[PDB]
């Protein structure tokens, strides 16, 4: 009923945060802010009406079923997670985190076959590594015998490095020993701004 986008927003102080929320039913929509380790705060209610204490940098708008919270000139206190709300329903939430700007860096893509030790257990884990890239926005798609995989992978992203201001991502594909030995080609497709075209690192089961 309430679809909030995007999931994560990595911005620098002074920029503008654009958070959208699509509803399946018209009604009074509110926006909340949750600073780290604090109770959520009412920012906007009834679509565009500003709550008490909220600066005019926060503005609410609505076009059709799409409600947008725009936060101009980001400050320290502005960062956190935002939620939209209609009645008892809440959006998934948008995470607005601090991003330190730098030059675009392409990820170094590595793929790791499951160990022979793990194969003894009955499950196999294929790990794709995206190392030291910028910006954070990166997509990883798994392909097994050139077939798109879904629901059997989990991603993990490190915080922005204090030295080089880059990010690193880890995607893990989990399959059973039986289902793993059924297929040959395993691949992860990495799409990133620092890449002219999607990069694919793969291996064939059995061969070295």
């Amino acid at each position: 009923v309430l679809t909030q986008s995007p999931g994560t927003l990595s911005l620098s102080p002074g920029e503008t945060a654009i958070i959208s929320c699509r509803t399946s039913q018209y009604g009074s929509l509110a926006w909340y802010q949750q600073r780290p380790g604090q109770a959520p705060r009412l920012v906007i209610y009834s679509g565009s009406t500003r709550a008490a204490g909220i600066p005019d940098r926060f503005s609410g708008s609505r076009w059709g079923p799409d409600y947008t919270l725009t936060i101009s000139n980001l400050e320290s206190g502005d960062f956190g997670v935002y939620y939209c709300q209609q009645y008892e329903f809440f959006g998934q939430g948008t995470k607005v985190q601090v991003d330190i700007k730098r030059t675009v860096a392409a990820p170094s893509v590595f793929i790791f076959p499951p160990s022979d030790e793990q194969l003894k257990s009955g499950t196999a884990s294929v790990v794709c590594l995206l190392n030291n890239f910028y910006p954070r926005e990166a997509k990883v798609q798994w392909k097994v015998d050139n077939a798109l995989q879904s629901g059997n992978s989990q991603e993990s992203v490190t915080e922005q490095d204090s030295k080089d201001s880059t990010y690193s991502l880890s995607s893990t594909l989990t399959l059973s020993k039986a289902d793993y030995e059924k297929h040959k080609v395993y691949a992860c497709e990495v799409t990133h701004q620092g890449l002219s075209s999607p990069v694919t690192k793969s291996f064939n089961r059995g061969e070295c």
């Binding site: 009074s28 959520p40 009645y87 939430g93 076959p113 490190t158 690193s168 893990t172």
Partner: protein, 228 residues
Amino acid sequence: QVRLSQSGGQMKKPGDSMRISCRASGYEFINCPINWIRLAPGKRPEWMGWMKPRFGAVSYARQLQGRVTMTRDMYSETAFLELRSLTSDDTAVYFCTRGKYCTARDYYNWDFEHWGQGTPVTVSSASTKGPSVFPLAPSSKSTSGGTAALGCLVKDYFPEPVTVSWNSGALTSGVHTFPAVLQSSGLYSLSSVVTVPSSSLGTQTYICNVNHKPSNTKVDKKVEPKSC
């Protein structure tokens, strides 16, 4: 000034029951309903129900029907929440809320201007499981005078956290230990990688040191390239 004070955090086991309080002040207590919202990291905030102090009228969310009870004390102006048969999915920070517009004649419930400070509730098994540590072979490619990548996979442990070092902490340059993820089995797992010169793979030894305090587990796994 409207205030909502909640009771302290607590830890529970699967099967237990929790009870938290919300003392209200600064307004006519029976004029506005009190809601209970729980927020868990990653998941959307979940409305549990509201309670109207007049006759203690309640309305529970359908998915929590049968496990939740909301009451109140008129003298102390305190609302109470009870959740029974707790599981891991109940792990969250619980809030009591109240609508912005609240008069003696009219109110709007869902504009939550007023929030309690929150009551953290952790529901987890007292059981501990040591991690399995599988090496991540750097593959047999990536140039001759360039960089490689190796690591070890720390899989199926409970609960958080685990810490990884390399060569007893001697190796820190190029190390990335990713945040753990929660698998469907209810067990955690993470990866710790490191990029090293490819020309050192046949000379320098690389060992990941995995530490898991809750299970008293310290395991060292030597990560070496496969021979075929």
